[PDB]
Design a protein around this ligand. Structure first.
Ligand code: K
Ligand code: K
Ligand code: K
Ligand code: K
Ligand code: K
Ligand code: K
Ligand code: K
Ligand code: K
Ligand code: K
Ligand code: K
Ligand code: K
Lengths: 107, 107, 107, 107, 107, 107, 107
């Protein structure tokens, strides 16, 4: 899992899971969805890196958790950052958030 | 009573109670309910897990409490998270909130 | 006076008084009252339980005080919470608020 | 002057003075006055009780001061609170505010 | 300069200067001036009293400074406060502000 | 360079530079510029005085820096303040800001 | 890689990378882009200078990172600042941000 990307300070870098609840487009088509609603949607992620300032024993790499879309921020894939590839050809999605935004671990 | 899901930091994971306020829908039908009102509605829940940073002796697993819908956030059922179940066939509702949002225990 | 409900942390649980100044029904009928105004209305209450984190010697059970409606939050009666009574058949009204919202005691 | 009402925490209970800005009613009748303006009007008050958490030597009972209407909150007269008298037949007006809202003393 | 009015806590009481920026009335008449603009106008004042909680050596009585109208608050003249004169016959204007709002001294 | 004006507390007094990037008025005439945009524009300034509470070794008088217009506040020239000159005959523009608003020095 | 510009306090000065997200001009022409969206766009940068108050071992000069456009602020190029060149003939873009806004390093 280790690529050239590390979390600093009190941040934590996670990697989004391939499957998320969105495979239930049960909602009527052509509806306008507000930003609050979109921000509440949970995102299943796996801890990839923990900032050196996150309190010791907070979580561990490999741990699975859930964060609302609105609490996390997308981080450019290290290859795109290191100018090797194009965003489109990257499947893995890295996101970040402050450790205090993490409420649980499916551990 | 426990499942593979634990609270971290200062968070607390509760499990919502079967019966709640919703029963009295004897209100006039077709009225638009604001978000503040909806956020006010209390939710009866039972403590399932207490984050390691919640001050010692704050509460105990099994304790029943009440939180406004607006103070808690829904957490994906560990089963759905661990990819075995579809949220639809899940009855137990897990929610989370910061410990400072808990004002009382029905003990 | 003590029912099976206790305040936790820095919260305080009070019990509203039977009579409130809501006897001044001398307001012109059919007027729309704003939320700020409604939130300003005082509520006479009696301390029923003090959270363990409220500084020692802050107040005592039985003490009468006044809080603006907007500063307190209604708490489900322990009977309703413990699924023994129906809300409608409950007279006592329990409310909660952070101790820092309490400015005085009528003692 | 001292009735059964005491200030707690960092609050201070004052008693409004009989004469206030309410005399200069030279302002054009029929004008709608905003809430900011109304909140700016000073209110002359006398310290009646100082919360035990207000820093020692901050002020003394009997001290006269001035607070903007928007910084203070009306407190029910102890007799109305103690259900001994009615609001209409009460002359003394008690108000409260946090000690940090007090900028001066007319001493 | 010293009348019966003292600053408490971290506040500072100043006395506004006779001539201010306003003299430059060369702008177009009948223009509606916003509140942000008005709040930015500087006010030349002289320190009259320093609260006991303002850090030692912050400033001295007699010191001249400048504060934006929006940062200071008018304080009733002690003669009006002590009920001897109607504000109209008062020329000295006292104002207050927190010490952290003071950026400089003209000395 | 030292005029009779000193910074107090955590403030810093700077003097604006004669030239700023406003020597690029190629912008289409008659356009309405928002406040956010205007507040963004950098201002080149030279440190004239450092408040006694600004941490030691933060910066030095004479140091050149850049601050967004929206982060600084204009300060009346000591000559206008000391009633020695009308504003119009003053070229030097003194400004102030909190030290935490300063991100760099061109030294 | 160092010119005459240094970061002070808790700030960090970075230098933007030549290639950025702007390469995918696939966005339908003539669409108005909101400010939130624009502020979210990541900007790849290289640490050029770390303020003396940024905690030791936070990052190192030369380190590559990613920051949302809305978190960073453009800093005038030292030569424009030192009145040695024109902004138009300057290629290198310097930006600044508080260290707490940095979530990762591509190390
Ligand atoms: K849509
Ligand atoms: K909305
Ligand atoms: K509805
Ligand atoms: K009504
Ligand atoms: K009116
Ligand atoms: K006007
Ligand atoms: K406006
Ligand atoms: K214009
Ligand atoms: K706008
Ligand atoms: K556009
Ligand atoms: K919008």
């Amino acid at each position: 899992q280790q690529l050239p990307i590390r979390a600093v300070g009190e941040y934590v870098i996670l990697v989004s899971e391939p499957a998320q609840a969105g495979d239930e487009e049960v909602t009527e088509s052509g509806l306008i969805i507000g930003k609050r609603v979109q921000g509440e949607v949970p995102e299943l992620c796996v801890v990839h890196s923990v900032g050196p300032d996150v309190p010791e024993g907070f979580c561990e790499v490999g741990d699975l958790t859930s964060l609302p879309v609105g609490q996390i921020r997308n981080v450019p894939h290290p290859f795109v950052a290191l100018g090797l590839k194009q965003p489109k050809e990257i499947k893995q999605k890295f996101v970040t958030c402050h450790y205090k935004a993490i409420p649980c671990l499916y551990k």
